Write a protein that holds these residues in place. Structure first.
Motif, PDB file in Angstrom:
ATOM      1  N   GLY C  16      14.016  14.493  19.720  1.00 38.72           N
ATOM      2  CA  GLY C  16      14.859  14.286  20.877  1.00 38.72           C
ATOM      3  C   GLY C  16      14.029  14.139  22.137  1.00 38.72           C
ATOM      4  O   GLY C  16      14.301  13.241  22.938  1.00 38.72           O
ATOM      5  N   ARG C  17      13.027  15.018  22.311  1.00 38.32           N
ATOM      6  CA  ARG C  17      12.057  14.951  23.441  1.00 38.32           C
ATOM      7  C   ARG C  17      11.127  13.694  23.379  1.00 38.32           C
ATOM      8  O   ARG C  17      11.601  12.554  23.158  1.00 38.32           O
ATOM      9  CB  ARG C  17      11.247  16.262  23.531  1.00 38.32           C
ATOM     10  N   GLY C  18       9.820  13.890  23.582  1.00 43.36           N
ATOM     11  CA  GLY C  18       8.898  12.760  23.589  1.00 43.36           C
ATOM     12  C   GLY C  18       7.956  12.844  22.411  1.00 43.36           C
ATOM     13  O   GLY C  18       8.334  13.347  21.347  1.00 43.36           O
ATOM     14  N   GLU C  19       6.729  12.355  22.605  1.00 48.41           N
ATOM     15  CA  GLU C  19       5.663  12.545  21.634  1.00 48.41           C
ATOM     16  C   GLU C  19       5.454  14.041  21.373  1.00 48.41           C
ATOM     17  O   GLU C  19       5.672  14.868  22.273  1.00 48.41           O
ATOM     18  CB  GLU C  19       4.363  11.887  22.124  1.00 48.41           C
ATOM     19  N   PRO C  20       5.066  14.395  20.130  1.00 49.22           N
ATOM     20  CA  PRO C  20       4.746  15.777  19.730  1.00 49.22           C
ATOM     21  C   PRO C  20       3.675  16.450  20.605  1.00 49.22           C
ATOM     22  O   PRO C  20       2.737  15.787  21.060  1.00 49.22           O
ATOM     23  CB  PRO C  20       4.221  15.615  18.295  1.00 49.22           C
ATOM     24  N   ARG C  21       3.826  17.753  20.824  1.00 48.02           N
ATOM     25  CA  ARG C  21       2.854  18.540  21.573  1.00 48.02           C
ATOM     26  C   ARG C  21       1.598  18.760  20.730  1.00 48.02           C
ATOM     27  O   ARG C  21       1.674  19.011  19.529  1.00 48.02           O
ATOM     28  CB  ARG C  21       3.462  19.890  22.001  1.00 48.02           C
ATOM     29  N   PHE C  22       0.440  18.659  21.371  1.00 44.78           N
ATOM     30  CA  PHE C  22      -0.820  18.908  20.707  1.00 44.78           C
ATOM     31  C   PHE C  22      -1.727  19.811  21.547  1.00 44.78           C
ATOM     32  O   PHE C  22      -2.091  19.496  22.693  1.00 44.78           O
ATOM     33  CB  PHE C  22      -1.517  17.591  20.375  1.00 44.78           C
ATOM     34  N   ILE C  23      -2.071  20.945  20.944  1.00 45.56           N
ATOM     35  CA  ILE C  23      -3.048  21.887  21.476  1.00 45.56           C
ATOM     36  C   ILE C  23      -4.219  22.023  20.506  1.00 45.56           C
ATOM     37  O   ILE C  23      -4.033  22.329  19.323  1.00 45.56           O
ATOM     38  CB  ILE C  23      -2.408  23.289  21.748  1.00 45.56           C
ATOM     39  N   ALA C  24      -5.419  21.761  20.997  1.00 45.42           N
ATOM     40  CA  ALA C  24      -6.629  22.063  20.243  1.00 45.42           C
ATOM     41  C   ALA C  24      -7.441  23.086  21.028  1.00 45.42           C
ATOM     42  O   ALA C  24      -7.387  23.096  22.259  1.00 45.42           O
ATOM     43  CB  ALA C  24      -7.430  20.810  20.000  1.00 45.42           C
ATOM     44  N   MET C  25      -8.152  23.968  20.325  1.00 45.20           N
ATOM     45  CA  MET C  25      -9.031  24.960  20.966  1.00 45.20           C
ATOM     46  C   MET C  25     -10.178  25.411  20.086  1.00 45.20           C
ATOM     47  O   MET C  25     -10.067  25.433  18.866  1.00 45.20           O
ATOM     48  CB  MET C  25      -8.266  26.187  21.488  1.00 45.20           C
ATOM     49  N   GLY C  26     -11.279  25.776  20.729  1.00 43.01           N
ATOM     50  CA  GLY C  26     -12.477  26.203  20.033  1.00 43.01           C
ATOM     51  C   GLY C  26     -12.812  27.651  20.308  1.00 43.01           C
ATOM     52  O   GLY C  26     -12.617  28.147  21.418  1.00 43.01           O
ATOM     53  N   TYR C  27     -13.325  28.323  19.282  1.00 39.72           N
ATOM     54  CA  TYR C  27     -13.774  29.700  19.405  1.00 39.72           C
ATOM     55  C   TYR C  27     -15.177  29.876  18.853  1.00 39.72           C
ATOM     56  O   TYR C  27     -15.453  29.496  17.715  1.00 39.72           O
ATOM     57  CB  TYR C  27     -12.830  30.633  18.654  1.00 39.72           C
ATOM     58  N   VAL C  28     -16.061  30.439  19.665  1.00 44.07           N
ATOM     59  CA  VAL C  28     -17.274  31.029  19.134  1.00 44.07           C
ATOM     60  C   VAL C  28     -16.946  32.495  19.004  1.00 44.07           C
ATOM     61  O   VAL C  28     -16.547  33.121  19.983  1.00 44.07           O
ATOM     62  CB  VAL C  28     -18.479  30.855  20.063  1.00 44.07           C
ATOM     63  N   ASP C  29     -17.097  33.032  17.798  1.00 46.82           N
ATOM     64  CA  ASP C  29     -16.664  34.399  17.475  1.00 46.82           C
ATOM     65  C   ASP C  29     -15.247  34.661  18.009  1.00 46.82           C
ATOM     66  O   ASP C  29     -14.316  33.956  17.613  1.00 46.82           O
ATOM     67  CB  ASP C  29     -17.681  35.457  17.949  1.00 46.82           C
ATOM     68  N   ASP C  30     -15.079  35.637  18.910  1.00 46.35           N
ATOM     69  CA  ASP C  30     -13.748  35.989  19.446  1.00 46.35           C
ATOM     70  C   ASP C  30     -13.533  35.488  20.862  1.00 46.35           C
ATOM     71  O   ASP C  30     -12.837  36.108  21.667  1.00 46.35           O
ATOM     72  CB  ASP C  30     -13.535  37.495  19.406  1.00 46.35           C
ATOM     73  N   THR C  31     -14.136  34.350  21.159  1.00 48.25           N
ATOM     74  CA  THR C  31     -14.147  33.851  22.513  1.00 48.25           C
ATOM     75  C   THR C  31     -13.818  32.379  22.553  1.00 48.25           C
ATOM     76  O   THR C  31     -14.583  31.522  22.081  1.00 48.25           O
ATOM     77  CB  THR C  31     -15.489  34.088  23.178  1.00 48.25           C
ATOM     78  N   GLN C  32     -12.653  32.103  23.119  1.00 48.39           N
ATOM     79  CA  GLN C  32     -12.198  30.754  23.283  1.00 48.39           C
ATOM     80  C   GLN C  32     -13.068  30.148  24.352  1.00 48.39           C
ATOM     81  O   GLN C  32     -13.178  30.693  25.442  1.00 48.39           O
ATOM     82  CB  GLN C  32     -10.735  30.754  23.707  1.00 48.39           C
ATOM     83  N   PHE C  33     -13.714  29.037  24.028  1.00 44.33           N
ATOM     84  CA  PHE C  33     -14.590  28.388  24.996  1.00 44.33           C
ATOM     85  C   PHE C  33     -14.139  27.024  25.478  1.00 44.33           C
ATOM     86  O   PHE C  33     -14.752  26.471  26.389  1.00 44.33           O
ATOM     87  CB  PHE C  33     -16.014  28.303  24.465  1.00 44.33           C
ATOM     88  N   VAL C  34     -13.070  26.497  24.872  1.00 43.45           N
ATOM     89  CA  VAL C  34     -12.583  25.149  25.165  1.00 43.45           C
ATOM     90  C   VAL C  34     -11.111  24.961  24.745  1.00 43.45           C
ATOM     91  O   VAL C  34     -10.648  25.603  23.798  1.00 43.45           O
ATOM     92  CB  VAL C  34     -13.525  24.102  24.526  1.00 43.45           C
ATOM     93  N   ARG C  35     -10.372  24.116  25.471  1.00 44.75           N
ATOM     94  CA  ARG C  35      -8.948  23.894  25.172  1.00 44.75           C
ATOM     95  C   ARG C  35      -8.376  22.520  25.557  1.00 44.75           C
ATOM     96  O   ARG C  35      -8.803  21.900  26.544  1.00 44.75           O
ATOM     97  CB  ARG C  35      -8.076  24.985  25.780  1.00 44.75           C
TER      98      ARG C  35
END
Lengths: 99, 9, 269
Positions: C16-35
């Motif tokens: 019903g809305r638009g294009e699908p939502r996309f989230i990507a993210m990176g973790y070194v150990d327990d630390t998100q470093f990128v999104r």
């Protein structure tokens, strides 16, 4: 396919009355990804609030962390109100100071 | 660094 | 407890809305470093730990350009998936994916893996041997064959073995300060009488691997000891506790002890 949110309400640092701190709601292990999360100071949603951002863990479940700057006082009540598809009623879990 | 291509199911 | 790199991605279609939502993210150990978020005003890969801001613009332009090509595939992947399982175009759906390398004794990797899940349940995983795939059902069985005809597990072994370890290290050094230095917990114990209960706190620690343990009069008693989920503090650190109801009389005879690679310290009330 259907997984209920695990909620945790607690401070950044050991709560001390009249001293600055952060309140944390940790909503985790929930699936699907749609979720409304509210922090409450004595009933009303508090506006000035950022979360982290949506992410998920090893088991394919999602998780988030919402927070505020706040100063604990003996009379003030604080809570977390999260809503998900998996539950008839929005769950309101109150913040225990030694918890 | 993220892996360049993604695979099509 | 070896170092790990993980890229996590999720696609949720909003019908019903638009294009699908996309989230990507990176973790070194327990630390998100990128999104990444297609929902952010300017969908583009961007930093989430100080040690990565360090990387150049062309690095970003390429990471962003690449993950941006990820979303397109997963948009197409969602439809494909909805057609395998014969699924009306009306319900919301989520396709998630993850890829990682885990570090062996010296430099070289210990475990590599890539896997997919559809609507919560598993789907397609890369095998240990980094050369085959296990499908969850007939639906994923189709993907296996595609991968197999496309000789694709090499391209994937390539990354996991080379790139992954390589950059894992680069980021580890460039973040020796935080990634490689352990924060030890500021522990203590608290009372609170109901009848009485005893809570053992561990705060401000890195990484989030910790075991907690209370001793009755001798060794391990874990039949009623409360096992609270280990939570983010909000700064780079973590928090946990274990707690027991003891009959209000012999209290300092209970000791909660905790290990963490940042020797196994032992403490009481």
């Amino acid at each position: 396919i259907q997984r209920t949110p695990k909620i945790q309400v607690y401070s950044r640092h050991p709560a001390e009355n009249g001293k600055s701190n952060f309140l944390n709601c940790y909503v985790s292990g929930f699936h699907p990804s749609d979720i409304e999360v509210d922090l409450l100071k004595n009933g009303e949603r508090i506006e000035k609030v950022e979360h982290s951002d949506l992410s998920f863990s090893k088991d394919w479940s999602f998780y988030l962390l919402y927070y505020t700057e706040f100063t604990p006082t003996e009379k003030d009540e604080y809570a977390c109100r999260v809503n998900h598809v998996t539950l008839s009623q929005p769950k309101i879990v109150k913040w225990d100071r030694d918890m | 660094r993220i892996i360049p291509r993604h695979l099509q199911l | 407890g070896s170092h790990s790199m993980r890229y996590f991605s999720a696609a949720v279609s909003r019908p019903g809305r638009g294009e699908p939502r996309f989230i990507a993210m990176g973790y070194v150990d327990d630390t998100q470093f990128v999104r990444f978020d297609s929902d952010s005003a300017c969908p583009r890969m961007e930093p989430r730990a100080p040690w990565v801001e360090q990387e150049g613009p062309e690095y970003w332009e390429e990471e962003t350009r690449n993950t941006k090509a990820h979303a397109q595939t997963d948009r197409m992947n969602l439809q494909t998936l909805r057609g395998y399982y014969n699924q009306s175009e009306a319900s919301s759906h989520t396709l998630q994916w993850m890829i990682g390398c885990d570090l062996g004794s010296d430099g070289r990797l210990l475990r590599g893996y890539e896997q997919y899940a559809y609507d919560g349940k598993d789907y397609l995983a890369l095998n240990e041997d980094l050369r085959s795939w296990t499908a969850a059902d007939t639906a994923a069985q189709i993907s296996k064959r595609k991968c197999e005809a496309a000789n694709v597990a090499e391209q994937r072994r390539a990354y996991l073995e080379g790139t992954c370890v390589e950059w894992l290290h680069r980021y580890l050094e460039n973040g020796k300060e935080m990634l490689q230095r352990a924060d030890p917990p500021k522990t203590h114990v608290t009372h609170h009488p109901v009848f009485a209960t005893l809570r053992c706190w561990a705060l401000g620690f890195y990484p989030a691997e910790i075991i907690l343990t209370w001793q009755r009069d001798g060794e391990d008693q874990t039949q009623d000891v409360e096992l609270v989920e280990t939570r983010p503090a909000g700064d780079g650190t973590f928090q946990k506790w274990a707690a027991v109801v003891v009959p209000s009389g012999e209290e300092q005879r209970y000791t909660c002890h905790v290990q963490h690679e940042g020797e196994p310290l032992m403490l009481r009330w």
